[PDB]
């Protein structure tokens, strides 16, 4: 919920998705920027989100284009 | 010893009844003069007085079958009334089998397995549930109305 400034994405991840769409699909990208929103352009990649100790790979899809990256990586376990 | 127990499906709060200025009389005029009362929840009201006076016809007005001269009777919102009339012949003039007569009042959520349980607790065993409802004893009929109140 970041008002009228537009959607926020870390710079080091903006180039990572940009330089990856050029060459197609590759190995999952490793990122710690959980706070970065999912732009429509990074659909189809498997960016790996760091939930504290391990990187979980999320397959970006059409419906997941408004939620932040960390929304899809549970950071604590239970049972 | 029959096992009778009345329960209550939806308990209601605050006042259960209110009667405001219920003067009424047939041909003596003041059968009961300027009645005014408010009946709470959990009351066990015993209406006494004995003979020819409106000892009944109060209950008949409260249920509504005897229109009052003046006044208004406001039952509670969800008030469901089980009536056991003093003279109850009209509900047995029709000649149904005891089983069908008790099954008339089965509610939403019970079987004729649960219908016959009331008769069993009321001591109608296997043949006395085949008699016509017309031919029954006075006590065996009062019990059969108790089992309709319990069922409702």
């Amino acid at each position: 919920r970041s008002l009228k400034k537009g959607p926020f994405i870390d710079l080091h991840l903006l180039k990572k998705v940009e330089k990856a769409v050029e060459s197609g699909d590759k190995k999952p990208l490793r990122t710690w920027s959980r706070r970065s929103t999912i732009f429509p352009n990074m659909i189809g990649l498997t960016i790996a989100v760091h939930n504290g100790r391990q990187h979980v790979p999320v397959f970006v899809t059409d419906e997941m284009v408004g939620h932040k990256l960390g929304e899809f990586a549970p950071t604590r376990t239970y049972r | 010893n029959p096992f009778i127990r009345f329960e209550q499906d939806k308990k209601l709060f605050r006042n259960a009844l209110e009667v405001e200025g219920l003067t009424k009389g047939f041909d003596n005029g003041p059968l009961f003069k300027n009645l005014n009362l408010l009946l709470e929840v959990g009351e066990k009201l015993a209406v006494l007085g004995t003979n020819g006076v409106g000892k009944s016809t109060l209950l008949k007005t409260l249920v509504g079958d005897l229109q009052p001269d003046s006044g208004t009777v406001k039952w509670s919102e969800n008030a469901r009334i089980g009536y056991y009339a003093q003279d109850h012949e009209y509900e047995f003039e029709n000649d149904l089998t005891v089983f069908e007569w008790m099954s008339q009042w089965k509610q939403e959520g019970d079987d004729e397995q649960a219908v016959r349980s009331i008769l069993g607790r009321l001591l109608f065993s296997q043949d006395d549930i085949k008699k016509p409802a017309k031919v029954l004893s006075g006590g065996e009929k009062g019990r059969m109305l108790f089992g309709k109140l319990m069922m409702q």
């Binding site: 400034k5 959607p7 408004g66 | -």
Partner: protein
């Protein structure tokens, strides 16, 4: 039939909001006014337009004022 155990059956004037005037016999005893019929049913367009909610990319791009 079997001597007046069935319900009454008389002709009624069933008419749609768009017309579709039909003279049928039915177990109502009173005329009815209802929606469209199969004559003008949107079967070629209702299921085409049934899907309306979906697609978050245009919702994201509509907010893109920056």
């Amino acid at each position: 039939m079997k001597k007046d155990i069935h319900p009454k059956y008389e002709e009624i004037t069933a008419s749609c909001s768009c017309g579709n005037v039909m003279k049928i016999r039915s177990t109502v005893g009173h005329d009815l006014n209802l929606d469209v019929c199969s004559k003008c049913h949107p079967f070629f367009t209702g299921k085409q337009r049934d899907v309306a909610t979906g697609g978050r990319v245009d919702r994201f791009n509509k907010r893109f004022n920056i």
